[PDB]
Amino acid sequence: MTILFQLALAALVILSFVMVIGVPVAYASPQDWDRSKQLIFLGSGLWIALVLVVGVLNFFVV
Protein backbone atom coordinates (compact mmCIF):
# COMPACT_ATOMS: atom_id res chain seq x y z
CA MET A 1 0.00 0.00 0.00
CA THR A 2 2.71 2.46 1.07
CA ILE A 3 5.45 1.55 -1.39
CA LEU A 4 2.53 1.04 -3.77
CA PHE A 5 1.67 4.67 -3.01
CA GLN A 6 5.25 5.96 -3.32
CA LEU A 7 5.45 4.15 -6.66
CA ALA A 8 2.34 5.80 -8.14
CA LEU A 9 3.26 9.20 -6.69
CA ALA A 10 6.93 8.95 -7.73
CA ALA A 11 6.22 7.56 -11.21
CA LEU A 12 3.58 10.29 -11.58
CA VAL A 13 6.44 12.78 -11.20
CA ILE A 14 8.70 11.27 -13.85
CA LEU A 15 5.75 10.99 -16.27
CA SER A 16 5.08 14.71 -15.71
CA PHE A 17 8.74 15.62 -16.25
CA VAL A 18 8.64 13.48 -19.43
CA MET A 19 5.18 14.74 -20.40
CA VAL A 20 6.22 18.36 -19.87
CA ILE A 21 9.30 18.22 -22.12
CA GLY A 22 7.28 16.08 -24.56
CA VAL A 23 4.01 17.85 -25.47
CA PRO A 24 6.09 20.93 -26.39
CA VAL A 25 8.50 19.37 -28.92
CA ALA A 26 5.37 17.45 -29.95
CA TYR A 27 3.17 20.21 -31.37
CA ALA A 28 6.51 21.84 -32.18
CA SER A 29 7.97 19.80 -35.04
CA PRO A 30 4.99 18.82 -37.25
CA GLN A 31 7.05 15.75 -38.20
CA ASP A 32 3.90 14.00 -36.90
CA TRP A 33 1.90 14.83 -33.75
CA ASP A 34 -0.28 12.34 -35.63
CA ARG A 35 1.83 9.34 -34.54
CA SER A 36 2.66 11.21 -31.33
CA LYS A 37 -0.97 12.32 -31.13
CA GLN A 38 -1.07 8.71 -29.95
CA LEU A 39 1.82 8.98 -27.48
CA ILE A 40 0.60 12.25 -25.94
CA PHE A 41 -2.90 10.81 -25.66
CA LEU A 42 -1.61 7.88 -23.64
CA GLY A 43 0.50 10.17 -21.48
CA SER A 44 -2.47 12.43 -20.80
CA GLY A 45 -4.93 9.64 -20.14
CA LEU A 46 -2.35 7.82 -18.02
CA TRP A 47 -1.55 10.90 -15.93
CA ILE A 48 -5.20 11.38 -14.75
CA ALA A 49 -5.61 7.79 -13.55
CA LEU A 50 -2.32 8.27 -11.67
CA VAL A 51 -3.54 11.44 -9.94
CA LEU A 52 -6.69 9.52 -9.04
CA VAL A 53 -4.53 6.65 -7.85
CA VAL A 54 -2.42 8.86 -5.56
CA GLY A 55 -5.63 10.69 -4.65
CA VAL A 56 -7.57 7.73 -3.32
CA LEU A 57 -4.36 6.04 -2.19
CA ASN A 58 -3.42 9.06 -0.03
CA PHE A 59 -6.16 8.37 2.48
CA PHE A 60 -4.57 5.03 3.28
CA VAL A 61 -0.99 6.20 3.90
CA VAL A 62 -1.52 9.61 5.57
Binding site: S16, V23, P24, Y27, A28, V51
Partner: protein, 448 residues
Protein backbone atom coordinates in the same frame (compact mmCIF):
# COMPACT_ATOMS: atom_id res chain seq x y z
CA UNK B 1 7.17 33.38 -40.75
CA UNK B 2 3.64 33.49 -39.35
CA UNK B 3 4.91 36.41 -37.27
CA UNK B 4 8.37 38.02 -37.18
CA UNK B 5 10.11 41.41 -37.31
CA UNK B 6 7.80 42.46 -40.16
CA UNK B 7 5.01 42.60 -37.57
CA UNK B 8 6.63 44.37 -34.55
CA UNK B 9 10.11 44.48 -32.95
CA UNK B 10 11.25 41.44 -30.93
CA UNK B 11 10.88 43.08 -27.51
CA UNK B 12 7.26 43.95 -28.38
CA UNK B 13 6.73 40.43 -29.62
CA UNK B 14 3.46 39.73 -27.83
CA UNK B 15 1.80 42.62 -29.68
CA UNK B 16 2.17 40.51 -32.83
CA UNK B 17 -0.66 38.46 -31.37
CA UNK B 18 -3.08 41.35 -31.27
CA UNK B 19 -4.85 39.77 -34.26
CA UNK B 20 -4.53 35.99 -33.92
CA UNK B 21 -7.41 35.21 -31.55
CA UNK B 22 -6.44 31.53 -31.38
CA UNK B 23 -2.81 32.01 -30.32
CA UNK B 24 -3.82 34.98 -28.17
CA UNK B 25 -5.90 32.37 -26.38
CA UNK B 26 -2.99 30.05 -25.74
CA UNK B 27 -1.25 32.91 -23.98
CA UNK B 28 -4.17 33.63 -21.68
CA UNK B 29 -4.68 29.91 -21.04
CA UNK B 30 -0.98 29.27 -20.54
CA UNK B 31 -0.66 32.32 -18.31
CA UNK B 32 -3.69 31.52 -16.18
CA UNK B 33 -1.74 28.31 -15.71
CA UNK B 34 1.23 30.09 -14.13
CA UNK B 35 -1.06 31.66 -11.54
CA UNK B 36 -2.59 28.38 -10.51
CA UNK B 37 0.85 26.79 -10.60
CA UNK B 38 2.16 29.45 -8.24
CA UNK B 39 -0.82 29.41 -5.88
CA UNK B 40 -0.52 25.66 -5.72
CA UNK B 41 3.24 25.28 -5.72
CA UNK B 42 3.63 28.02 -3.07
CA UNK B 43 1.05 26.66 -0.64
CA UNK B 44 2.94 23.37 -0.46
CA UNK B 45 6.16 25.39 -0.01
CA UNK B 46 4.56 27.24 2.87
CA UNK B 47 3.13 24.07 4.45
CA UNK B 48 6.46 22.29 3.96
CA UNK B 49 7.96 24.92 6.27
CA UNK B 50 4.88 25.58 8.40
CA UNK B 51 5.33 24.96 12.16
CA UNK B 52 1.93 24.45 13.88
CA UNK B 53 2.86 25.74 17.35
CA UNK B 54 4.06 29.15 16.14
CA UNK B 55 2.40 32.29 14.72
CA UNK B 56 1.82 32.27 10.97
CA UNK B 57 3.06 35.82 10.67
CA UNK B 58 6.37 34.64 12.12
CA UNK B 59 6.82 32.22 9.26
CA UNK B 60 6.54 34.29 6.11
CA UNK B 61 3.20 32.84 5.14
CA UNK B 62 0.72 34.67 2.95
CA UNK B 63 -1.50 31.93 1.46
CA UNK B 64 -2.08 29.57 4.38
CA UNK B 65 -3.40 32.65 6.23
CA UNK B 66 -5.80 33.26 3.31
CA UNK B 67 -7.20 29.78 3.67
CA UNK B 68 -7.29 30.03 7.45
CA UNK B 69 -9.54 33.07 7.12
CA UNK B 70 -12.12 31.04 5.16
CA UNK B 71 -12.31 28.78 8.21
CA UNK B 72 -9.97 25.92 7.29
CA UNK B 73 -7.64 23.97 9.56
CA UNK B 74 -8.07 26.43 12.39
CA UNK B 75 -10.16 26.82 15.49
CA UNK B 76 -10.29 28.81 18.76
CA UNK B 77 -8.18 31.98 18.46
CA UNK B 78 -6.63 30.96 15.14
CA UNK B 79 -5.18 27.79 16.62
CA UNK B 80 -4.13 25.47 13.79
CA UNK B 81 -6.04 22.18 14.04
CA UNK B 82 -5.70 20.26 10.76
CA UNK B 83 -3.10 21.06 8.07
CA UNK B 84 -4.95 18.90 5.56
CA UNK B 85 -7.13 21.60 4.03
CA UNK B 86 -3.89 23.48 3.35
CA UNK B 87 -2.16 20.53 1.64
CA UNK B 88 -5.34 19.92 -0.35
CA UNK B 89 -5.88 23.44 -1.68
CA UNK B 90 -2.22 23.43 -2.56
CA UNK B 91 -2.01 20.19 -4.52
CA UNK B 92 -5.35 20.68 -6.29
CA UNK B 93 -4.24 24.00 -7.77
CA UNK B 94 -0.82 22.58 -8.64
CA UNK B 95 -2.58 19.88 -10.68
CA UNK B 96 -5.02 22.15 -12.49
CA UNK B 97 -1.92 24.13 -13.51
CA UNK B 98 -0.88 21.18 -15.64
CA UNK B 99 -4.33 20.94 -17.22
CA UNK B 100 -4.43 24.64 -18.09
CA UNK B 101 -0.77 24.67 -19.14
CA UNK B 102 -1.60 21.89 -21.56
CA UNK B 103 -4.31 23.95 -23.27
CA UNK B 104 -2.14 27.02 -23.32
CA UNK B 105 0.79 25.30 -25.02
CA UNK B 106 -1.65 23.56 -27.35
CA UNK B 107 -3.56 26.70 -28.51
CA UNK B 108 -0.29 28.59 -28.99
CA UNK B 109 1.72 26.11 -31.07
CA UNK B 110 -0.54 23.40 -32.62
CA UNK B 111 -4.21 24.40 -32.74
CA UNK B 112 -5.65 27.13 -35.02
CA UNK B 113 -3.57 30.33 -35.22
CA UNK B 114 -6.85 32.22 -35.64
CA UNK B 115 -10.34 31.38 -34.42
CA UNK B 116 -12.89 33.20 -36.58
CA UNK B 117 -12.91 30.31 -39.07
CA UNK B 118 -12.29 27.22 -36.84
CA UNK B 119 -15.52 28.31 -35.08
CA UNK B 120 -17.30 31.65 -35.43
CA UNK B 121 -18.59 31.41 -31.83
CA UNK B 122 -15.14 31.72 -30.29
CA UNK B 123 -13.39 33.72 -33.00
CA UNK B 124 -13.93 37.44 -32.37
CA UNK B 125 -13.55 40.97 -33.69
CA UNK B 126 -12.18 43.70 -31.43
CA UNK B 127 -14.42 46.32 -33.06
CA UNK B 128 -17.37 43.90 -32.77
CA UNK B 129 -19.11 45.87 -30.04
CA UNK B 130 -21.45 42.91 -29.48
CA UNK B 131 -19.01 40.03 -29.31
CA UNK B 132 -17.09 42.16 -26.87
CA UNK B 133 -20.12 43.16 -24.77
CA UNK B 134 -21.01 39.47 -24.79
CA UNK B 135 -17.71 37.79 -23.89
CA UNK B 136 -17.47 40.46 -21.19
CA UNK B 137 -20.95 39.33 -20.21
CA UNK B 138 -19.87 35.70 -19.91
CA UNK B 139 -16.97 36.61 -17.61
CA UNK B 140 -19.20 38.99 -15.61
CA UNK B 141 -21.23 35.86 -14.72
CA UNK B 142 -18.29 33.56 -13.98
CA UNK B 143 -17.03 36.18 -11.52
CA UNK B 144 -20.54 36.57 -10.14
CA UNK B 145 -20.90 32.87 -9.43
CA UNK B 146 -17.55 33.10 -7.66
CA UNK B 147 -18.75 35.88 -5.39
CA UNK B 148 -21.53 33.51 -4.33
CA UNK B 149 -19.10 30.62 -4.02
CA UNK B 150 -17.87 32.55 -0.98
CA UNK B 151 -21.34 33.37 0.37
CA UNK B 152 -21.87 29.60 0.31
CA UNK B 153 -18.71 28.51 2.18
CA UNK B 154 -19.64 30.98 4.92
CA UNK B 155 -23.38 30.30 5.28
CA UNK B 156 -23.50 26.59 4.49
CA UNK B 157 -20.14 24.88 4.18
CA UNK B 158 -18.37 25.89 7.41
CA UNK B 159 -18.02 29.61 8.03
CA UNK B 160 -15.06 31.98 8.10
CA UNK B 161 -12.63 33.02 10.79
CA UNK B 162 -14.33 35.74 12.77
CA UNK B 163 -11.79 37.35 15.08
CA UNK B 164 -14.57 39.35 16.68
CA UNK B 165 -16.10 36.04 17.75
CA UNK B 166 -18.15 36.62 20.95
CA UNK B 167 -16.33 33.89 22.82
CA UNK B 168 -13.11 35.19 21.31
CA UNK B 169 -11.76 34.66 17.80
CA UNK B 170 -13.12 31.48 16.24
CA UNK B 171 -14.57 29.90 13.07
CA UNK B 172 -18.19 31.03 12.86
CA UNK B 173 -21.08 30.26 10.48
CA UNK B 174 -22.70 33.42 9.16
CA UNK B 175 -26.44 32.92 9.01
CA UNK B 176 -27.64 36.51 8.79
CA UNK B 177 -25.95 38.41 5.97
CA UNK B 178 -26.59 42.15 5.93
CA UNK B 179 -28.71 42.56 2.80
CA UNK B 180 -29.97 46.04 3.66
CA UNK B 181 -28.80 48.10 0.66
CA UNK B 182 -28.89 51.29 2.74
CA UNK B 183 -26.03 49.75 4.78
CA UNK B 184 -24.22 47.61 2.23
CA UNK B 185 -23.83 50.38 -0.35
CA UNK B 186 -23.42 52.84 2.53
CA UNK B 187 -19.77 51.88 2.58
CA UNK B 188 -19.24 53.32 -0.89
CA UNK B 189 -20.44 56.71 0.32
CA UNK B 190 -17.95 56.65 3.21
CA UNK B 191 -14.99 59.03 3.30
CA UNK B 192 -11.59 57.47 2.59
CA UNK B 193 -9.94 59.58 5.28
CA UNK B 194 -9.26 59.06 9.00
CA UNK B 195 -12.15 57.48 10.86
CA UNK B 196 -14.66 57.01 8.06
CA UNK B 197 -12.49 54.64 6.05
CA UNK B 198 -14.64 53.67 3.04
CA UNK B 199 -14.53 50.01 1.94
CA UNK B 200 -11.66 49.20 4.28
CA UNK B 201 -13.83 50.08 7.28
CA UNK B 202 -15.80 46.83 6.92
CA UNK B 203 -15.68 45.36 10.43
CA UNK B 204 -17.94 42.30 10.77
CA UNK B 205 -18.56 39.24 8.71
CA UNK B 206 -22.29 39.86 8.12
CA UNK B 207 -21.55 42.87 5.91
CA UNK B 208 -18.72 40.98 4.17
CA UNK B 209 -20.99 38.01 3.42
CA UNK B 210 -24.01 40.23 2.87
CA UNK B 211 -22.16 42.52 0.52
CA UNK B 212 -20.81 39.61 -1.49
CA UNK B 213 -24.38 38.39 -1.92
CA UNK B 214 -25.22 41.73 -3.54
CA UNK B 215 -22.12 41.68 -5.76
CA UNK B 216 -22.77 38.15 -6.96
CA UNK B 217 -26.27 39.03 -8.10
CA UNK B 218 -25.60 42.59 -9.33
CA UNK B 219 -22.66 41.04 -11.18
CA UNK B 220 -24.45 38.17 -12.93
CA UNK B 221 -27.32 40.57 -13.72
CA UNK B 222 -24.91 42.68 -15.71
CA UNK B 223 -23.52 39.51 -17.24
CA UNK B 224 -26.88 38.74 -18.80
CA UNK B 225 -27.54 42.37 -19.72
CA UNK B 226 -24.32 42.54 -21.81
CA UNK B 227 -25.02 39.15 -23.36
CA UNK B 228 -28.34 40.62 -24.46
CA UNK B 229 -27.09 44.00 -25.73
CA UNK B 230 -24.79 46.45 -27.51
CA UNK B 231 -23.22 49.66 -26.20
CA UNK B 232 -25.68 52.55 -26.51
CA UNK B 233 -24.73 55.77 -28.32
CA UNK B 234 -22.58 57.78 -25.94
CA UNK B 235 -21.04 54.54 -24.76
CA UNK B 236 -19.80 54.41 -28.34
CA UNK B 237 -19.01 58.07 -29.08
CA UNK B 238 -17.09 58.13 -25.79
CA UNK B 239 -14.76 55.11 -25.83
CA UNK B 240 -12.10 53.86 -28.24
CA UNK B 241 -12.82 50.45 -29.74
CA UNK B 242 -9.61 48.50 -30.22
CA UNK B 243 -7.48 45.67 -28.86
CA UNK B 244 -5.19 47.99 -26.98
CA UNK B 245 -7.82 50.42 -25.76
CA UNK B 246 -9.71 47.53 -24.11
CA UNK B 247 -6.51 46.36 -22.43
CA UNK B 248 -5.75 49.82 -21.10
CA UNK B 249 -9.20 50.11 -19.50
CA UNK B 250 -8.57 46.82 -17.67
CA UNK B 251 -5.08 48.03 -16.73
CA UNK B 252 -6.30 51.14 -15.00
CA UNK B 253 -8.89 48.93 -13.33
CA UNK B 254 -6.37 46.55 -11.75
CA UNK B 255 -4.13 49.43 -10.70
CA UNK B 256 -7.00 50.90 -8.69
CA UNK B 257 -7.83 47.53 -7.17
CA UNK B 258 -4.15 47.19 -6.36
CA UNK B 259 -4.11 50.36 -4.30
CA UNK B 260 -7.33 49.41 -2.56
CA UNK B 261 -5.81 46.04 -1.68
CA UNK B 262 -2.66 47.66 -0.27
CA UNK B 263 -4.79 49.64 2.19
CA UNK B 264 -7.00 46.70 3.08
CA UNK B 265 -4.12 44.49 4.22
CA UNK B 266 -2.50 47.43 5.96
CA UNK B 267 -5.57 48.72 7.83
CA UNK B 268 -8.26 46.06 7.99
CA UNK B 269 -8.52 43.79 11.02
CA UNK B 270 -11.52 41.68 9.94
CA UNK B 271 -10.92 40.08 6.53
CA UNK B 272 -7.25 40.02 7.46
CA UNK B 273 -7.11 38.53 10.97
CA UNK B 274 -4.19 39.79 13.05
CA UNK B 275 -4.08 36.19 14.29
CA UNK B 276 -2.78 34.83 10.98
CA UNK B 277 -1.21 37.98 9.53
CA UNK B 278 0.49 40.27 12.00
CA UNK B 279 -0.94 43.05 14.17
CA UNK B 280 -1.91 46.09 12.13
CA UNK B 281 0.32 49.18 12.09
CA UNK B 282 -2.05 51.17 14.37
CA UNK B 283 -2.86 48.04 16.38
CA UNK B 284 0.78 47.64 17.37
CA UNK B 285 1.31 51.26 18.39
CA UNK B 286 -1.87 50.96 20.42
CA UNK B 287 -0.57 47.84 22.16
CA UNK B 288 2.55 49.67 23.38
CA UNK B 289 0.37 52.21 25.18
CA UNK B 290 -1.75 49.34 26.52
CA UNK B 291 1.36 47.50 27.72
CA UNK B 292 2.84 50.43 29.63
CA UNK B 293 -0.39 51.85 30.97
CA UNK B 294 -0.86 48.30 32.23
CA UNK B 295 2.64 48.05 33.67
CA UNK B 296 3.05 51.33 35.46
CA UNK B 297 -0.51 51.04 36.77
CA UNK B 298 0.64 47.94 38.63
CA UNK B 299 3.52 49.95 40.08
CA UNK B 300 0.94 52.24 41.68
CA UNK B 301 0.56 54.97 39.08
CA UNK B 302 -2.80 56.66 38.51
CA UNK B 303 -3.05 56.49 34.71
CA UNK B 304 -6.02 58.82 34.62
CA UNK B 305 -4.12 61.82 35.99
CA UNK B 306 -0.54 61.19 34.83
CA UNK B 307 1.03 64.24 33.18
CA UNK B 308 3.67 63.68 30.47
CA UNK B 309 6.59 65.98 29.46
CA UNK B 310 4.35 68.21 27.31
CA UNK B 311 1.51 68.37 29.83
CA UNK B 312 -0.78 66.22 27.71
CA UNK B 313 -1.13 62.93 29.52
CA UNK B 314 1.44 60.16 29.64
CA UNK B 315 -1.12 57.35 29.30
CA UNK B 316 -4.54 58.79 28.44
CA UNK B 317 -5.53 61.96 26.60
CA UNK B 318 -8.45 63.27 24.52
CA UNK B 319 -8.98 63.17 20.77
CA UNK B 320 -10.07 66.28 18.84
CA UNK B 321 -13.77 65.45 19.30
CA UNK B 322 -13.57 64.65 23.02
CA UNK B 323 -13.10 60.86 23.28
CA UNK B 324 -10.60 59.32 25.70
CA UNK B 325 -7.70 57.68 23.85
CA UNK B 326 -4.19 56.39 24.52
CA UNK B 327 -1.55 59.07 24.78
CA UNK B 328 1.85 59.53 23.15
CA UNK B 329 2.57 59.54 19.43
CA UNK B 330 -0.16 56.90 19.44
CA UNK B 331 -2.69 59.69 19.42
CA UNK B 332 -2.70 59.31 15.64
CA UNK B 333 -4.11 55.81 15.81
CA UNK B 334 -7.12 56.54 17.99
CA UNK B 335 -9.24 55.08 15.21
CA UNK B 336 -7.97 51.59 15.95
CA UNK B 337 -10.57 49.05 17.01
CA UNK B 338 -9.76 45.45 17.92
CA UNK B 339 -11.10 42.44 19.79
CA UNK B 340 -8.43 42.57 22.46
CA UNK B 341 -8.90 46.30 23.13
CA UNK B 342 -12.67 46.86 22.78
CA UNK B 343 -13.78 45.49 26.19
CA UNK B 344 -11.93 48.47 27.67
CA UNK B 345 -13.79 51.01 25.58
CA UNK B 346 -16.79 52.77 27.07
CA UNK B 347 -19.41 55.01 25.48
CA UNK B 348 -16.87 57.83 25.62
CA UNK B 349 -13.80 55.83 24.72
CA UNK B 350 -11.38 54.02 27.04
CA UNK B 351 -13.14 53.81 30.43
CA UNK B 352 -10.95 54.69 33.39
CA UNK B 353 -12.71 52.12 35.59
CA UNK B 354 -12.32 49.14 33.32
CA UNK B 355 -8.74 50.14 32.57
CA UNK B 356 -8.38 50.38 36.34
CA UNK B 357 -9.55 46.84 37.22
CA UNK B 358 -11.00 44.91 34.25
CA UNK B 359 -7.83 44.46 32.23
CA UNK B 360 -7.51 40.70 31.71
CA UNK B 361 -4.25 38.72 31.45
CA UNK B 362 -5.01 37.47 27.97
CA UNK B 363 -5.18 41.11 27.02
CA UNK B 364 -1.95 41.99 28.76
CA UNK B 365 -0.14 39.29 26.80
CA UNK B 366 -2.02 40.13 23.62
CA UNK B 367 -0.82 43.75 23.92
CA UNK B 368 2.68 42.47 24.67
CA UNK B 369 2.63 40.05 21.71
CA UNK B 370 1.41 42.64 19.25
CA UNK B 371 3.74 45.28 20.68
CA UNK B 372 6.75 43.11 19.93
CA UNK B 373 5.54 42.17 16.47
CA UNK B 374 4.83 45.56 14.93
CA UNK B 375 5.24 45.72 11.14
CA UNK B 376 8.74 47.21 11.15
CA UNK B 377 11.60 45.37 9.41
CA UNK B 378 14.37 45.41 6.80
CA UNK B 379 14.73 44.06 3.28
CA UNK B 380 17.04 41.32 4.56
CA UNK B 381 14.29 40.52 7.10
CA UNK B 382 15.58 41.90 10.40
CA UNK B 383 12.54 42.74 12.47
CA UNK B 384 12.54 46.07 14.26
CA UNK B 385 13.74 49.63 13.79
CA UNK B 386 16.54 50.47 11.37
CA UNK B 387 18.94 50.84 14.31
CA UNK B 388 18.13 47.45 15.82
CA UNK B 389 20.45 44.47 16.11
CA UNK B 390 20.33 41.16 14.22
CA UNK B 391 18.59 38.22 15.98
CA UNK B 392 14.86 38.37 15.38
CA UNK B 393 14.45 37.48 11.71
CA UNK B 394 10.96 38.80 10.92
CA UNK B 395 9.01 41.15 8.65
CA UNK B 396 5.23 41.33 9.00
CA UNK B 397 3.18 39.63 6.27
CA UNK B 398 1.19 42.86 6.25
CA UNK B 399 4.34 44.78 5.24
CA UNK B 400 5.27 42.32 2.49
CA UNK B 401 1.80 42.24 0.99
CA UNK B 402 1.27 46.02 1.19
CA UNK B 403 4.56 46.95 -0.51
CA UNK B 404 4.52 44.35 -3.26
CA UNK B 405 1.03 45.44 -4.20
CA UNK B 406 1.71 49.14 -4.15
CA UNK B 407 4.56 48.61 -6.61
CA UNK B 408 2.44 46.42 -8.85
CA UNK B 409 -0.56 48.73 -8.44
CA UNK B 410 1.68 51.66 -9.44
CA UNK B 411 3.47 50.31 -12.48
CA UNK B 412 0.04 49.24 -13.67
CA UNK B 413 -1.17 52.84 -13.55
CA UNK B 414 1.81 53.63 -15.80
CA UNK B 415 0.80 50.66 -17.88
CA UNK B 416 -2.63 52.25 -18.13
CA UNK B 417 -1.36 55.66 -19.22
CA UNK B 418 1.00 53.97 -21.72
CA UNK B 419 -1.48 51.62 -23.39
CA UNK B 420 -4.21 54.28 -23.35
CA UNK B 421 -1.92 56.86 -24.90
CA UNK B 422 -1.02 54.37 -27.61
CA UNK B 423 -4.63 53.45 -28.29
CA UNK B 424 -5.73 57.06 -28.80
CA UNK B 425 -2.90 57.74 -31.27
CA UNK B 426 -3.40 54.38 -32.90
CA UNK B 427 -7.11 55.06 -33.44
CA UNK B 428 -6.87 58.59 -34.88
CA UNK B 429 -3.75 57.03 -36.41
CA UNK B 430 -0.39 58.74 -35.73
CA UNK B 431 1.27 56.42 -33.18
CA UNK B 432 4.16 55.95 -35.60
CA UNK B 433 5.05 59.55 -36.30
CA UNK B 434 3.97 62.92 -37.62
CA UNK B 435 3.14 62.84 -41.33
CA UNK B 436 6.16 64.53 -42.81
CA UNK B 437 3.79 65.86 -45.47
CA UNK B 438 0.71 66.91 -43.51
CA UNK B 439 2.24 68.15 -40.25
CA UNK B 440 -0.88 69.28 -38.29
CA UNK B 441 0.92 71.93 -36.25
CA UNK B 442 1.91 73.55 -39.54
CA UNK B 443 -1.74 74.26 -40.43
CA UNK B 444 -2.47 76.06 -37.18
CA UNK B 445 -2.19 79.84 -36.66
CA UNK B 446 0.87 81.15 -34.84
CA UNK B 447 0.17 81.99 -31.19
CA UNK B 448 3.70 83.40 -30.83
Amino acid sequence: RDQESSGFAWWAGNARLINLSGKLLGAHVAHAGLIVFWAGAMTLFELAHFIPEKPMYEQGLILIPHIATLGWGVGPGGEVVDTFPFFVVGVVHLISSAVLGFGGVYHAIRGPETLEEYSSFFGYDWKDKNKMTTILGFHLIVLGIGALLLVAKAMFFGGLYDTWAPGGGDVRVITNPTLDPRVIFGYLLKSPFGGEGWIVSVNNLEDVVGGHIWIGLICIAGGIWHILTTPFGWARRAFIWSGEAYLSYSLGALSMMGFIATCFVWFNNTVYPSEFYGPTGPEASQAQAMTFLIRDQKLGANVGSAQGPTGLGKYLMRSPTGEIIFGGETMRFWDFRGPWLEPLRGPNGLDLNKIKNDIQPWQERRAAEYMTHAPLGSLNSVGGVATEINSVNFVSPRSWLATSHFVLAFFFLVGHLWHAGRARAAAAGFEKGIDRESEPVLSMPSLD
